[PDB]
Ligand binder design. Structure first.
Ligand SMILES: [Mn+2]
Length: 130
């Protein structure tokens, strides 16, 4: 998977507004291959369907939260390497540690600017050779 226009993103958040923010930012960056999920379960359903190259995910969500989502992804043999960018209002140092240790590719705190998102994605792309 490479960071070109075809790269397929999954945007996960229990609030429409927040998904709408990320989708528009991605479009702006030239990425139009984008789907949405409303919680961790919904997300895995789409992921296991196949084809995705990048996940941007909230933390606090019903049914399955984003830390659990990330742990599940990281533990699954077929998708253990999937890039996962956490986007959350959670800023306590112990939250950041938990997500980091669980295998987050990056971590952005809400609210965030267009510049901030661009720069954290580019950081993941460079780190992973995409
Ligand atoms: Mn949420």
């Amino acid at each position: 998977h490479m960071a070109d226009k075809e790269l397929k993103f999954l945007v996960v958040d229990d609030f429409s507004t927040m998904r709408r923010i990320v989708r528009n930012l991605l479009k702006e960056l030239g990425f139009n291959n984008v789907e949405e999920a409303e919680d961790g379960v919904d997300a895995l359903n789409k992921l296991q369907a196949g084809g995705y190259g990048f996940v941007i995910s909230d933390w606090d969500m019903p049914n399955m939260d984003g830390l659990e989502l990330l742990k599940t992804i990281r533990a699954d043999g077929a998708m253990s390497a999937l890039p996962v960018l956490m986007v959350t209002a959670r800023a306590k140092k112990e939250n950041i540690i938990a997500a980091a240790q669980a295998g987050a590719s990056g971590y952005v705190v809400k609210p965030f600017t267009a510049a901030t998102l661009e720069e954290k994605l580019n950081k993941i792309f460079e780190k992973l050779g995409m």
